[PDB]
A paper describes a structure:
The PWWP domain comprises 100–130 amine acids and is often present in chromatin-associated proteins. The canonical β-barrel core harbors an aromatic cage constructed by three aromatic residues, which is a signature feature of the Tudor domain “Royal family”.
DNMT3A and DNMT3B are de novo DNA methyltransferases and the loss-of-function mutations in human DNMT3B causes a developmental defect characterized by hypomethylation of pericentromeric repeats and are implicated in ICF (immunodeficiency, centromeric instability, facial anomalies) syndrome. DNMT3A had been shown to bind histone H3K36me3, but we were not able to obtain its cocrystals with H3K36me3, Nevertheless, we found a bis-tris buffer molecule in both the DNMT3A and DNMT3B structures. The bis-tris molecule resides in the conserved aromatic cage of the PWWP domains. The bis-tris molecule is bound to DNMT3A and DNMT3B in slightly different conformations. In the DNMT3B structure, the bis-tris molecule forms one hydrogen bond with the D266 residue from DNMT3B, and three more hydrogen bonds with the conserved residues G231, I233 and S237 via the conserved water molecule. The bis-tris molecule in complex with the PWWP domain of DNMT3A or DNMT3B provides a clue for designing small molecules targeting their histone binding domain. A mutation in the PWWP domain of DNMT3B diminishes its interaction with the SUMO E3 ligase PIAS1.
Numbering used by the authors: 215 to 318, 326 to 351
Write the structure that this text describes.
Amino acid sequence: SEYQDGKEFGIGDLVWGKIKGFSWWPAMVVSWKATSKRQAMSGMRWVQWFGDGKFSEVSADKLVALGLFSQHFNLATFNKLVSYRKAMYHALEKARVRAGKTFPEDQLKPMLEWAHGGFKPTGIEGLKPN
């Protein structure tokens, strides 16, 4: 009954997570058992950040589906930080495999165009965990 608090987001979900002083960052919702920490408080979820693999306990109100991409993608942070560019690659690679998508900085370009364009042809349904 982990995360049975009435709030959104379950294990395996791709999300944007917001920490104070940082841009919205891509992550995956994980079970507390993967963290080596403790059970999350009601209303909170454990997430693992793409690019650095670290764990954080984040309020479900500070998470949004990764699928709301153009809405949370930060162009200024993308241009400024190589760590954000690397996080985008790992998050969009996970999204690509889940959606059954195939592509023909250079690797990132068509993945970013696919994400910004609404993850066509599956849309956001293709990012759901199996």
